[PDB]
Design an enzyme around this catalytic site. Structure first.
Site, PDB file in Angstrom:
ATOM      1  N   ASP B  25       0.794  -1.230   0.000  1.00 58.48           N
ATOM      2  CA  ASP B  25       0.000   0.000   0.000  1.00 58.48           C
ATOM      3  C   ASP B  25       0.823   1.276   0.000  1.00 58.48           C
ATOM      4  O   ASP B  25       1.313   1.719   1.049  1.00 58.48           O
ATOM      5  CB  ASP B  25      -0.861  -0.039   1.276  1.00 58.48           C
ATOM      6  CG  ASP B  25      -1.840   1.131   1.232  1.00 58.48           C
ATOM      7  OD1 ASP B  25      -1.859   1.885   0.212  1.00 58.48           O
ATOM      8  OD2 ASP B  25      -2.593   1.244   2.237  1.00 58.48           O
ATOM      9  N   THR B  26       0.931   1.910  -1.140  1.00 61.65           N
ATOM     10  CA  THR B  26       1.673   3.170  -1.223  1.00 61.65           C
ATOM     11  C   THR B  26       0.992   4.327  -0.478  1.00 61.65           C
ATOM     12  O   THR B  26       1.631   5.345  -0.219  1.00 61.65           O
ATOM     13  CB  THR B  26       1.876   3.607  -2.680  1.00 61.65           C
ATOM     14  OG1 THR B  26       0.585   3.741  -3.309  1.00 61.65           O
ATOM     15  CG2 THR B  26       2.726   2.552  -3.376  1.00 61.65           C
ATOM     16  N   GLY B  27      -0.279   4.156  -0.143  1.00 63.70           N
ATOM     17  CA  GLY B  27      -1.033   5.161   0.608  1.00 63.70           C
ATOM     18  C   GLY B  27      -0.923   4.986   2.126  1.00 63.70           C
ATOM     19  O   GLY B  27      -1.573   5.731   2.894  1.00 63.70           O
TER      20      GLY B  27
HETATM   21  C1  AB1 Z   1      -1.996   6.702   6.394  1.00 61.96           C
HETATM   22  C2  AB1 Z   1      -1.392   5.670   7.106  1.00 61.96           C
HETATM   23  C3  AB1 Z   1      -0.449   6.004   8.100  1.00 61.96           C
HETATM   24  C4  AB1 Z   1       0.108   4.964   8.859  1.00 61.96           C
HETATM   25  C5  AB1 Z   1      -0.257   3.652   8.618  1.00 61.96           C
HETATM   26  C6  AB1 Z   1      -1.213   3.300   7.676  1.00 61.96           C
HETATM   27  C7  AB1 Z   1      -1.478   1.918   7.462  1.00 61.96           C
HETATM   28  C8  AB1 Z   1      -1.753   4.341   6.941  1.00 61.96           C
HETATM   29  O1  AB1 Z   1      -2.672   4.040   5.990  1.00 61.96           O
HETATM   30  C9  AB1 Z   1      -3.973   3.899   6.613  1.00 61.96           C
HETATM   31  C10 AB1 Z   1      -5.030   3.765   5.519  1.00 61.96           C
HETATM   32  O2  AB1 Z   1      -6.175   3.399   5.839  1.00 61.96           O
HETATM   33  N1  AB1 Z   1      -4.638   4.062   4.259  1.00 61.96           N
HETATM   34  C11 AB1 Z   1      -5.629   4.110   3.164  1.00 61.96           C
HETATM   35  C12 AB1 Z   1      -5.545   5.493   2.545  1.00 61.96           C
HETATM   36  C13 AB1 Z   1      -5.755   6.557   3.440  1.00 61.96           C
HETATM   37  C14 AB1 Z   1      -4.720   7.396   3.791  1.00 61.96           C
HETATM   38  C15 AB1 Z   1      -4.807   8.460   4.657  1.00 61.96           C
HETATM   39  C16 AB1 Z   1      -6.075   8.708   5.242  1.00 61.96           C
HETATM   40  C17 AB1 Z   1      -7.144   7.950   4.863  1.00 61.96           C
HETATM   41  C18 AB1 Z   1      -6.998   6.879   3.986  1.00 61.96           C
HETATM   42  C19 AB1 Z   1      -5.412   3.004   2.132  1.00 61.96           C
HETATM   43  O3  AB1 Z   1      -4.121   3.193   1.547  1.00 61.96           O
HETATM   44  C20 AB1 Z   1      -5.506   1.580   2.638  1.00 61.96           C
HETATM   45  C21 AB1 Z   1      -6.912   1.094   2.989  1.00 61.96           C
HETATM   46  C22 AB1 Z   1      -6.902  -0.402   3.284  1.00 61.96           C
HETATM   47  C23 AB1 Z   1      -8.115  -0.992   3.614  1.00 61.96           C
HETATM   48  C24 AB1 Z   1      -8.509  -1.018   4.966  1.00 61.96           C
HETATM   49  C25 AB1 Z   1      -9.659  -1.658   5.332  1.00 61.96           C
HETATM   50  C26 AB1 Z   1     -10.474  -2.327   4.434  1.00 61.96           C
HETATM   51  C27 AB1 Z   1     -10.082  -2.350   3.088  1.00 61.96           C
HETATM   52  C28 AB1 Z   1      -8.876  -1.735   2.723  1.00 61.96           C
HETATM   53  N2  AB1 Z   1      -7.831   1.353   1.864  1.00 61.96           N
HETATM   54  C29 AB1 Z   1      -9.027   1.904   2.040  1.00 61.96           C
HETATM   55  O4  AB1 Z   1      -9.493   2.319   3.108  1.00 61.96           O
HETATM   56  C30 AB1 Z   1      -9.852   2.055   0.770  1.00 61.96           C
HETATM   57  C31 AB1 Z   1     -10.572   3.390   0.645  1.00 61.96           C
HETATM   58  C32 AB1 Z   1      -9.500   4.487   0.678  1.00 61.96           C
HETATM   59  C33 AB1 Z   1     -11.296   3.463  -0.699  1.00 61.96           C
HETATM   60  N3  AB1 Z   1     -10.817   0.922   0.754  1.00 61.96           N
HETATM   61  C34 AB1 Z   1     -11.879   0.898   1.795  1.00 61.96           C
HETATM   62  C35 AB1 Z   1     -13.166   0.317   1.231  1.00 61.96           C
HETATM   63  C36 AB1 Z   1     -12.897  -1.076   0.682  1.00 61.96           C
HETATM   64  N4  AB1 Z   1     -11.675  -1.072  -0.162  1.00 61.96           N
HETATM   65  C37 AB1 Z   1     -10.738  -0.064  -0.136  1.00 61.96           C
HETATM   66  O5  AB1 Z   1      -9.807  -0.064  -0.963  1.00 61.96           O
END
Ligand code: AB1
Ligand code: CL
Ligand code: CL
Ligand code: CL
Ligand code: NA
Lengths: 99, 99
Positions: B25-27
């Site tokens: 996850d690049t995000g």
């Molecule tokens: C920002 C950050 C700092 C420290 C550590 C971590 C892991 C960090 O990232 C936390 C984070 O949730 N990052 C998200 C983007 C992020 C960065 C900063 C603030 C907010 C969000 C994103 O990249 C990953 C995360 C993964 C995920 C989690 C639970 C269920 C499914 C997937 N993906 C999602 O939430 C996506 C949303 C964005 C459409 N998502 C959720 C609906 C189902 N599928 C899906 O793909």
């Protein structure tokens, strides 16, 4: 470009005639933008991840220029803490993860 | 490898002797894994996702393999719905986003 990951991979995007900074997010299925107006019909949905769920409005066939590369697809709009370019548009600009 | 994004970039990781599935996850700034036992002392941390913030346990200098690539670094443990390999370890294994 080849983007390293020492910092967040933030790029400038053009959407709805507006410039925004957004995160290139391989961990996101969808493209999620903070509140803005977009043309056409929309449908509500929920997005849940770390921290819980938010409500968004889903708009289809929206063009976005991402760091100079055009792509069209579904964009959802809602109270996201950061603008996110997810896989539905990263595929269209040909982005891959390489190691 | 070169990983396209038409599907989620899921890989196998190995941590504490066990194989698990995780999202590249690049995000994500940091690497967060579902509840498991890790050695040593931990420090408090909060991480923000799409719906708000969660508390996690931060462990440092943890041995972890990501898609066969050996790494040693910080792993946080907490109530995440999905195991996430974030930029701290992606950078260590040489990953870049390219387009
Ligand atoms: C920002 C950050 C700092 C420290 C550590 C971590 C892991 C960090 O990232 C936390 C984070 O949730 N990052 C998200 C983007 C992020 C960065 C900063 C603030 C907010 C969000 C994103 O990249 C990953 C995360 C993964 C995920 C989690 C639970 C269920 C499914 C997937 N993906 C999602 O939430 C996506 C949303 C964005 C459409 N998502 C959720 C609906 C189902 N599928 C899906 O793909
Ligand atoms: Cl789409
Ligand atoms: Cl392709
Ligand atoms: Cl680290
Ligand atoms: Na539309």
């Amino acid at each position: 470009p080849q983007i390293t990951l020492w910092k967040r991979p933030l790029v400038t995007i053009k959407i709805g005639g507006q410039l925004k900074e957004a995160l290139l997010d391989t961990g996101a299925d969808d493209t999620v933008i903070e509140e803005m107006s977009l043309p056409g019909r929309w449908k509500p949905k929920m997005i849940g991840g770390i921290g819980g769920f938010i409500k968004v409005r889903q708009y289809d066939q929206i063009i976005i220029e991402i760091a100079g590369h055009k792509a069209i697809g579904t964009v959802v709009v809602g109270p996201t803490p950061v603008n996110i370019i997810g896989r539905n548009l990263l595929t269209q600009i040909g982005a891959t993860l390489n190691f």
